[PDB]
């Protein structure tokens, strides 16, 4: 199975540069062109450029000729993209894609890499339990006062998936993000399992498990 594994979110300073990787696997790296795409928040896809891995030859969207440098490393089967003189217009999700010849299309896409460009400093979330002071019971965790986006939240290390809603972050008037992750359980199934939220804030290297105590 073809896979495009992009590198993690990144906070970076205005004027700085940032390198993103796209580790590929399940196909001969050199036999496919790799393209990059930008998506600014609430916006559409912009083609940045493509690289022939076999001989390193590149093609750039003129809008990015001053911004982007695509390179490869044939040994690790990894494409890279470097963005320089970053401004807050560089704040976006970046995708790597593979081109298939059929008739050309971008047939496999990475998960994307969120780049934030800001003066403000990283900050890890605080994680607080959400417990009640019926047919179904709800609990959750409050993931508070972090910067930048994103956080990931899972329940019981990925074993609890259904009834889970992780809300999108809201920017607080403090310029810090906050969100809640909740799960509902039919009352009858409540008192079998325990409930632990696992919160990951890569930009701050925070990993936090919070067990939400069911009342006695």
């Amino acid at each position: 199975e073809v896979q495009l594994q992009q590198s993690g979110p990144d906070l970076v300073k205005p004027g700085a540069s940032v390198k993103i990787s796209c580790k590929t696997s399940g196909y001969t790296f050199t036999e496919y062109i790799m393209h990059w795409v930008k998506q600014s928040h609430g916006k559409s896809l912009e083609w940045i450029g493509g690289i022939i891995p076999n001989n390193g030859g590149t093609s750039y969207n003129q809008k990015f000729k001053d911004k982007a440098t695509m390179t490869v490393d044939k040994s690790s089967s990894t494409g890279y993209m470097e963005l320089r003189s970053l401004t807050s217009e560089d704040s976006a999700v970046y995708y790597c894609t593979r081109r298939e010849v059929y008739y050309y299309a971008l047939d496999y896409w990475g998960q994307g890499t969120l780049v934030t460009v800001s003066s403000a400093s990283t900050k890890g979330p605080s994680v607080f339990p959400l417990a009640p002071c019926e047919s179904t019971a709800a609990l959750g965790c409050l993931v508070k006062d972090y910067f930048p986006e994103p956080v990931t939240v899972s329940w019981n290390s990925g074993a609890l998936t259904s009834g889970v809603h992780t809300f999108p972050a809201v920017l607080q008037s403090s310029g810090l993000y906050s969100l809640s992750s909740v799960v509902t359980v039919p009352s009858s199934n409540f008192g079998t399992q325990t409930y632990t939220c696992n919160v990951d804030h890569k930009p701050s290297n925070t990993k936090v498990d919070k067990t939400v105590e069911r009342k006695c």
């Binding site: 093609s59 969207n61 339990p129």
Partner: protein, 212 residues
Amino acid sequence: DIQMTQTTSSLSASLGDRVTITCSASQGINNYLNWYQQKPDGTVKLLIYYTSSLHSGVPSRFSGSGSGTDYSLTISNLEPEDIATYYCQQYSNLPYTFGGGTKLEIKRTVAAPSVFIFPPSDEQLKSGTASVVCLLNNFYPREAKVQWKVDNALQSGNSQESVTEQDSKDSTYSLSSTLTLSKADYEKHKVYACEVTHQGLSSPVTKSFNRG
């Protein structure tokens, strides 16, 4: 540069309906037109290539049509998993350019939220801030009024809402309302209440707890 216009950027449709998404190029692109699907979690899939060919593993309710400047993606009978933003892309000229996208809102039958309220933890309180969370679970449609009442006094200006994307299985939304107070303000009040008004509820539902 060839500009790709998706004039309709927000489109609603009922489960089982025929759905048409359109794309026009600023000049003829000789059928060199692909369609992509982006799910709410940001994942992108190829649907259609060269105007009309299904990508490997794409359901047959998806078809592509058109020539010259005008192209359509048609979904013959909408399924809940089709909730997404759809994008066109020309590869006739460099640079490759993309339409602005069309986001689907799936229309299903009315479902009232179930409502939960959560007091702040001591772990939070000890740092100077109380967050009070009200949850509205698995409702349709999107429109809901959530009013915070503290000792039966209607609050204003001190809560924020967040809403999930429409669920890929049941086409519902979920919503959080968070009331933020100082510890000192939290401790001057007894009853914290969120009152929910929605089309699925014949009268407002209120959930509350007593502090102390």
